[PDB]
Amino acid sequence: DTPYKADLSRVHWAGSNSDVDIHLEIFEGDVDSGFMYNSFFRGNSSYVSVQDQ
Amino acid sequence: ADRELFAANIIDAHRQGIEEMVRRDLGGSLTEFITVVSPYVFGLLLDSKKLVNV
């Protein structure tokens, strides 16, 4: 390995030996969930209303 | 041993996956999917006498 392996400076690595990872995540706005669906058989039947009666 | 039967097996295996995809409400986007096939399997498809016939 390179001679500077022990005297190596690092950024966003914490601890005396520079091992702990404290980097920042890059978030852009993506959100994931279930897929879409729509009704198909709405008007293929007979209709009767009993609203408020 | 017969090439046509092997091609039929491959086609049925593909059809099973397509049917599974259709059940997850993904059937409306079949024009966006892609199939990647190796030269051997690509050459096996041409032997089937139902994809190339008129």
Side-chain angles (χ1 to χ4, degrees):
Chain A
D1 44 4
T2 59
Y4 326 113
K5 164 68 167 280
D7 313 320
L8 205 72
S9 178
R10 311 180 95 193
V11 182
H12 286 331
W13 297 88
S16 53
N17 308 349
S18 310
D19 313 328
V20 182
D21 189 355
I22 44 161
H23 282 85
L24 289 162
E25 280 143 30
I26 300 301
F27 181 85
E28 301 197 340
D30 295 304
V31 190
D32 205 6
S33 83
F35 299 134
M36 157 170 20
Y37 184 70
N38 279 281
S39 179
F40 197 112
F41 301 111
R42 174 73 68 192
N44 287 16
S45 149
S46 190
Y47 190 88
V48 183
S49 183
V50 300
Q51 170 97 69
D52 284 337
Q53 291 155 71
Chain B
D2 179 26
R3 285 175 58 85
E4 311 207 8
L5 308 198
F6 198 17
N9 289 338
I10 291 160
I11 291 167
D12 312 343
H14 192 279
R15 174 151 45 235
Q16 289 184 38
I18 291 291
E19 287 165 355
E20 245 281 340
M21 267 320 105
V22 166
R23 260 172 277 160
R24 297 167 184 189
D25 297 333
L26 299 172
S29 287
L30 290 186
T31 46
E32 314 206 80
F33 284 69
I34 304 177
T35 307
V36 183
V37 189
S38 92
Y40 187 40
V41 179
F42 183 89
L44 267 165
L45 292 169
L46 271 155
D47 284 44
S48 81
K49 272 155 195 71
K50 298 199 73 156
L51 282 176
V52 187
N53 198 357
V54 166

